[PDB]
Structure formats: structure tokens, C-alpha cells
Amino acid sequence: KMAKNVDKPLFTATFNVQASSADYATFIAGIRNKLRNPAHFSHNRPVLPPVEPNVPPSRWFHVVLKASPTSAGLTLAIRADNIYLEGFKSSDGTWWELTPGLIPGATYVGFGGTYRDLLGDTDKLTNVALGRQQLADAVTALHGRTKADKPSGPKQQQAREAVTTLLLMVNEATRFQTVSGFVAGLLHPKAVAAASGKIGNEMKAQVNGWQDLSAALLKTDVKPPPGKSPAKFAPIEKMGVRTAVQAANTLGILLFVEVPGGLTVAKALELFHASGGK
Template sequence: MLLQKLFIMQWFVQVWHKMNIRAVLLVVLLVIHEGAGAGGRPRRPPEQWYKPGTSGSFYVENSPYTDVVDEMKDWIKDQRDKETDDLEEYPDNPVLKKQFLKSKPAHWFLPLLLGRSTTKTNLAFRSDNLYLSGFTNGEGSWFSFETDGEYVIPESTVLGFRGNYRDLVAGGVGTDEQAWTHLIGLAIGRGAVLEAIAVVNGYNPNTTPDADIKRALATLIVVFMEAQRFPYIRQRVHDAWKSENGGSLDALGAEMVVHWKRTSCALLIWATKQDKGDWNSKEARKLMEDPPEGLRIFTPEQARATIGPVLRSEHCSE
């Protein structure tokens, strides 16, 4: 009888031991399954699309405009194309890195604009062309623009319009180069920027009128990035920012925005010439024309004074 009891106890211990092992194996298999994608392959961690990037918080209601744009200007200089000697002797004209529009840029500029009360928006600008790729509303949801196969912020809501002025201010009518006329009179003072932040903060694609969000985004683009491209626009915004009555973009400032690529190409072509008096590229000749076709720019010195950062375009004539 004693032997029989010992046998039963030994059998019970063995079964219990096996059950524990199976339970542990089951837990392990469940953990592996939860961390796997289709076919049992390990899942990739979500893409941290915003890295690498430079960010900063700007209190628009209280900050001097120069504090905001000067910091962004430093961001651009830090992320210039340091592998080229094109125009390197002109620090106010940093050459941007080559664009690969179907891919994430090498770096992001991510200013957080803080407005009245708790209103805010985070903007995402590409470092290779200073174009706005996306923005957040007050809930932190990301939105991006419709594109032709260009890079889109992962898991963002893609809107039914593009981020160019033709869509933002011209109602989708005409060409990109004709849209500048709709920027004339755009309010660019501090109050207008605070109102734009409030619109973007409260943005809901189901309830916010398209015209409102488009106008707000155009305001933020002009005030913060066209002002980097063109010193004239920067000064115009600076004056409006300080004025109690605000201010607006005039015809000359509006005309400039469609000439950034052309002026950049003219300077990059000129930089390759041994004869620095040779200002005769297709782009340079076009710039000599009267506005709006040109900007009455007759020398490389005038061109360098007209723009800040230089866009590296693949569509220059030479």
C-alpha cells in the first residue's frame, strides 16, 4: 500500500510539472504572437518620421518677431548642404540640400506655435525646400496635403487639397505662377498670426470651412517661411508685427514668392562660371524683366540680396 501511494504521488508531481511547463510555453507563445505581424514575423516599431528634426516653442502673443525668425534662420543655416562649396562665401545665402521629394527629408523643422490661451499648432517644414508638409490641430492630430506621389507624413490625415498657393488662396484656379495675385493684401501682423493659429488649433476636416483653414495655413507659410526666403517679406512682416494696426503683404512681396526657384537657379549657375561677370543664364535674363514676369534683377549681387536660402532645383537650365 505504501508503494502504491508513493507511485501515485510521483505520478501527480510529474503531471503537475508538465502542466507548468506547458503553461509557461503557452504564455511565451502568446507574447511572441502579440509581437508578431502577418506570418508570425516580428512587427516593426512605428516610424518616428519626425527624426531627425529641429524643434522649438514660440509664444507668438509675447515674442518679438525677430526672436522667432532668427532662430529659424539658424536652423536653416545648420542644415545647409555642407558638402558643396557653391556660394559658401555668402553666409546669408545657404544652399539647401538636394531634394528627394518622394522620400522623407534629411531633416525636419518643427516649430510649435503657441497662440492665445491654449491654442497651438505644430508645423512640419522640409529642410530641403522649406515647404510645409503637415500640421497639427489642438488635439495633436497630424494632417498633410494631397501630393503627386511625394512623401506624406505617416498615419496623418491627407487633405483633399495641395499645399501650394494655387490651392490655398486661388481656389485651385490658374497656374502656380499666377496664384501670387491672391496673396496681395494677406494680413501678416501678429494679430493675423494669432487668428491663424486659432483656426488651425480648432481644425476639424468635417466642420471647418476649407477656405478658413487654407487662408490660415497660407498666413503661417508666408510669415514664417517666405520670410526666410525673402528678406523683403521678412521686413514687411516685422513692421506689421510691431504695428497695432497690423499690416499686409504688398504686390512686390507677393510677386517674389514665384521667383525663388528662378533666382536660386540663376545664382547656382552663376557660381559655376569662371567669369563672374557672366550673368546671362536663361533664369538671369528672365529676372531682368519687369514684375511680375521678373523682378528687375540685373546682377548676382542684387539676386543674393533678394533671397536668403538657395533652393537646389533639378530643373535649372544649365
């Protein structure tokens, strides 16, 4: 079934690609803040509300990426429950989708939104150059797409790399303080040489295990039966995350996961609604 409210975003976050590192950090933090379930934090990190059951994805936000403070932005359509990128809007007004048949009126771009779809393998995230120019070039490539272009092998490859670039610099940045901090570290004033960088294996593991890391921290919040010890964090060595404090420093915003003894989908959504959440 088709998604609802794709063009009725709960909020819009906007970033000028030439703006400062501080403004980028502010931009990412604001996304996390607007996505949060105000009734559910873990170690003072925000947790997303659960995914709504019995309905197709009906909660969305937009990210607008601008080449400059005056320029028309590239609009991204992202789910507000799991931060999945599913759509982007080019300058001619065409909505492109990463899943065939998901967004009403949209045109399928020719490939999917998983890293296997985009790179061939999730192990290849360590090969993707990130930085200010890569961000700007990705915005240019996707924003300039027109409905009438004849797709080509090279153009699709360009489009894949552009989507991958944005997924990392927007979506994964939102999910992980490690990734957002890394990207913030690549952004400098014009007086500084152009810079680019690739993520290491720890961040790759984090990106490929968001649910696992979210669940691992959530488990530590479960109050024990009386007369027993608080659950201890189970290390995830591949992510470089051995303790709950490290997990908290790593997680930008947690995916909601039902863990034994914790909130259910229904109860967390009940608390979300009671706190004003939409």
C-alpha cells in the same frame, strides 16, 4: 510612396506669436542656418542640400508656433530639402496633411498646399493680410481643429486662409529676406497700434519664382573656362532683382538647382555629408 521621419524632425524651431520683431528675425535666421548645406553657399547666402534621390521625402523639421510662452504650440511638419509645408498637428493630437496619403496616420485636411489650391490663383498672394493678429488667428484656427468636427464650407475657407498665412509668415519668410524683413516690419510692441500689410508685386514674383531666382544666382558661381568672362547675373525685372548683389540681399536660403557647370545632386550631397550634414 509615403514620407519617412515626419515625426523625427532634424530640428525644431519655436516662435511665440507675441514675441518681439527681433526674436522673429532670430527665429527665421535660425531655420535658415539649420537647413543649410555647410559645404555650399552662394554669395554668402546658404543653399539647401539637394533633394535625396531614390527615396520618398525623408528629411523633415518642425516649427512650433505658440500663442504664449506657456501655451502648447501648433506644430508644423516641413520638408528640410525644399521647405514645403505638408502637415500640422492640432491640440487633440491629430496630424493633418495637405497631400492625401503622404504622412503615415495623418488625416487629409480637404485641400492642397499650393497657392492655386489655397487661393485659386498664384496671382492672389497680394491679397493676403499678414501681421501679428493674422498669425495668432491662423495658429488658433489650425490648432483648434479636431478630428471629429464636421467640415463645412466656411471652416474650410478659414483653414485655407490660415495655411496661406503661415506659409507666407514661416516658409516664404525663411526663403526670402524680403519677406522675412516685411513680416518683421509688421511686428511691434503692444504700445504700438495693431498693424497688418500685404506683399507687393515684387515679393509675389519672388515667392512664385524661388527656383528661378536660386538658379539665377547659382549660375554666377560657375567658374568660366580659362580665358573667358565670369557669368553675369540675368535680371529678373518682375522680382525687382537686376544684379547678383540684389539677388543675394533677396534670397534667405537658396533651393538647390543643378545648373550647367555647377554641382550635381550627387556631388553636393557628397559635400553635405562630408561636412556633417544630416
